Write a protein that binds this ligand. Structure first.
Ligand code: ADP
Length: 308
């Protein structure tokens, strides 16, 4: 186990590209919980994830779940977009009876109740009703939260990861030489205190900051994401060898500055998977080929080597 903990950044980067500054902070925070220098009555981790969207917030969250608890299923997501009113609370903990399916339970509690070794992701944390924070704050004090039926749900074995892009438009400046390692984590801290109570922020083990990806990185994701496709082709002994520009073509169409790498997968679907099929069906690509994918003025181009 100690081998996993000391090496924690390697095991994480296996799926998460760059963000070393982000990755180090969570791996140091986790090393602190284990080894025993924390309050035991607190979740294994609480982190504020700040940065743009599409740049890996969730990836890390899934990865952290996969590497820390043996699976990406070990991660409960709650979107704070759908919890913005008085009727918010009653979903998270399931606060009837009488009121609809309380006999079902509350989804935060119930999820944590059935799967206590998990990673809980709250997105858009700013959107939540100020009433929701009290609930989340007690979860960080005692590490324990009583549901509506008087079942106390035990969060002490979890990792809580909140996301927001409140600090983003003032992190796109840091990016430009000006501000280096810290100073962004710190100047952004001032904008958070303008939205969040300090009783909440000082429970958070860390506010981690997530820089945008650069065309050399997008490229690296571009590769990882073919994996399934590549695997699936392999069964037919087909290889899929790309070209530098071809990679760049993907990224270009696949990376919205405000929606990060979110689009790319479908992009790959539309620009690469689609035409590929025609050819495979049309017999342009036979079983057992080295496909040479590349760019053109009407999009990607596929060629095969003169057999032999
Ligand atoms: N650092 C990263 N490492 C690997 N893949 C990434 C990274 N950042 C983004 N991606 C890719 O982008 C897609 C969505 O990323 P995601 O974490 O959902 O972004 P966000 O949550 O910020 O919108 C994933 O399918 C993933 O493959």
């Amino acid at each position: 186990e100690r081998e996993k903990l000391l090496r924690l950044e390697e095991e994480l980067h296996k799926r998460v590209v760059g963000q070393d500054e982000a990755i180090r902070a969570v791996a140091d925070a986790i090393r602190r919980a284990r080894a025993g220098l924390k309050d035991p009555n607190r979740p294994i981790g609480s982190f504020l994830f700040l940065g743009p969207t599409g740049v890996g917030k969730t990836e890390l969250a899934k990865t952290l779940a996969a590497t820390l608890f043996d699976t990406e299923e070990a991660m409960i997501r709650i979107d704070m977009t759908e919890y913005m009113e008085k009727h918010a609370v009653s979903r998270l903990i399931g606060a009837p009876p009488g009121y609809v399916g309380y006999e079902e339970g509350g989804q935060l509690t119930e999820a944590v109740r059935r799967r206590p070794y998990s990673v809980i992701l709250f997105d858009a944390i700013e959107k939540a009703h100020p009433d929701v924070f009290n609930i989340l704050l007690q979860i960080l004090d005692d590490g324990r939260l009583t549901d509506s039926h008087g079942r106390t749900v035990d969060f002490r074995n979890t990792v809580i990861i909140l996301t927001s892009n409140l600090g983003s438009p003032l992190i796109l400046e840091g990016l430009q030489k000006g501000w280096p390692y810290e100073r962004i984590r710190d100047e952004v801290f001032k904008v958070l205190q303008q939205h969040f109570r300090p009783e909440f922020l000082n429970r958070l083990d860390e506010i981690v900051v997530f820089r945008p990806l650069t065309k050399e990185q997008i490229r690296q994701i571009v590769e990882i994401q073919l994996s399934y496709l590549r695997a699936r082709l392999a069964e037919k002994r087909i290889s899929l060898e790309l070209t530098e520009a071809a990679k760049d073509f993907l990224a270009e169409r696949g990376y919205d500055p405000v929606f990060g790498a979110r689009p790319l997968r479908r992009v790959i679907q539309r620009e690469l998977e689609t035409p590929l099929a025609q050819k495979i069906l049309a017999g342009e690509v036979k079983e057992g080929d080295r496909v040479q994918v590349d760019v053109g003025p009407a999009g990607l181009v596929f060629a095969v080597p003169a057999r032999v």
